[PDB]
Amino acid sequence: MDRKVAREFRHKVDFLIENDAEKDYLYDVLRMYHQTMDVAVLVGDLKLVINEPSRLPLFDAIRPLIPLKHQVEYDQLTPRRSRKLKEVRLDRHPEGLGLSVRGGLEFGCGLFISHLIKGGQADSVGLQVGDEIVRINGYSISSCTHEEVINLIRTKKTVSIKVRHIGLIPVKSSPDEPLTWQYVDQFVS
């Protein structure tokens, strides 16, 4: 039943990574770790290839091969890969919602919490930097431009927010640049 694992992983790699050089890198990465058994280096190496939200499921595919002795440090080092959806209701508080938000349809990427004011209302309720805001007021926002979403958030007295924790932030720092992604701990600066 080992060949079943290898096959499954090899095609999920083929499907989620276009360039052969990054594939070769990925396999070399895990192979090096399989010799070193250094898990901090493995996640540190993995993040330079699993760089975009579509590739994040490879952290779960790699995961069953991780020895239990490394399992928990693996979890400390990976973004939270739980697919569960946290739902929230925020009220119009003198300091406001207490979050900052970036992305939208015109960028071809979802809408992410990029800043969370410590102690504000968003933090009171457990939202976190790196959540993708999936829904607002019950509506999927996938067809909304950025300004449309901000409009939709401001339509009523309170705002319903359902997020899925991603752990990546979109970065394009002016129009020339292609959109890429960064992990949360780095993006803060």
Partner: protein, 75 residues
């Protein structure tokens, strides 16, 4: 099942009251962006919401063509 892109669109703009007329005229969001001020006068939209609709349509047409940089909106 989800709201159509037209519905979310109008919802975001406080224009939700026009979803039943746009549907009777078979106006999806595709067709909506093809509409002029005079098109919307033909279905008896009054001046106030005409301006709000066309403002929203034009903001959307522009950022789809020129997204610009990613921006942080503080809420």
């Amino acid at each position: 099942v989800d709201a159509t892109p037209l519905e979310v669109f109008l919802q975001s703009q406080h224009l939700e009251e026009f979803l039943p007329i746009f549907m009777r005229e078979q106006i999806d969001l595709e067709a909506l962006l093809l509409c002029s001020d005079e098109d919307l006068q033909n279905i008896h939209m009054q001046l106030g919401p005409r301006k709000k609709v066309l403002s929203a349509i034009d903001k959307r047409k522009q950022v789809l063509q020129q997204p610009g940089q990613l921006v942080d909106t503080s809420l």
